[PDB]
Amino acid sequence: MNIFEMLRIDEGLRLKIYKDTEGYYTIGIGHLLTKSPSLNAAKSELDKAIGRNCNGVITKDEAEKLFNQDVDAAVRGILRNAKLKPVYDSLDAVRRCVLINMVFQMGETGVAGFTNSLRMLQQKRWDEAAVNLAKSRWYNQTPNRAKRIITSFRTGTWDAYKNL
C-alpha cells in the first residue's frame, strides 16, 4: 500500500464536478475546486486547472495528473511548515503516509492546528494521540475515514486499509 492507493481509497475518483462532504465543488481524486457556491465559478477554476475547456468533465489521465500535483504539494507543504516538518521527520514510513493523508484532506494550516496531537505523535505516544485526535470536528464529520487514520497512527501498519 502506498500514499496514492491510500488516498484513492479515501477520496474516490469522480470525472464530473461534484460536491464534497462539506458541499464544495470538487473533481477527480478529492481535488477541491472552489468553496464558491457557484457551479460556474467551479467550471472556470476547472478549466484554468486543466488548461482546457472541460465543460465540468475531465478524463482519467487529467484526474491523475491533478492527483500527482496535489500529493506533491501536500508533501512539500509539510517540509516547509515549521510545525509539521519536525513531526514528519520523527515518524516512520507508514505514519508519514498518514500525516500526508491528513494534510491533503484538511490543508497544512488545518493539521498544524492540532497542537496537542502533533506533540503526542512526536513523542510516539500512539494511544494518547488517537484519543486526542478523535476530539475534533474532523472526526465527528467523517468518522469512518478519521477512524482509519487514527488506527493507522495507532498501529503503524496498513491494516485499516487492507480491508478496503
UniProtKB/Swiss-Prot annotation:
Broadest EC class assigned to this enzyme: hydrolase
Swiss-Prot/TrEMBL induction comment: Expressed late in the viral replication.
Outcome after substituting G30F: Almost complete loss of enzymatic activity. The enzyme is destabilized by 1.5 kcal/mol
Effect of N132 to M/F: 2-fold decrease in enzymatic activity
Catalytic residue list: E11 (proton donor/acceptor), D20 (proton donor/acceptor)
UniProt: substrate binding residues: L32, F104, S117, N132
Cross-referenced Pfam families: Phage_lysozyme
Function: Endolysin with lysozyme activity that degrades host peptidoglycans and participates with the holin and spanin proteins in the sequential events which lead to the programmed host cell lysis releasing the mature viral particles. Once the holin has permeabilized the host cell membrane, the endolysin can reach the periplasm and break down the peptidoglycan layer.
Protein name in the entry: Endolysin
Protein source organism: Enterobacteria phage T4 (Bacteriophage T4)
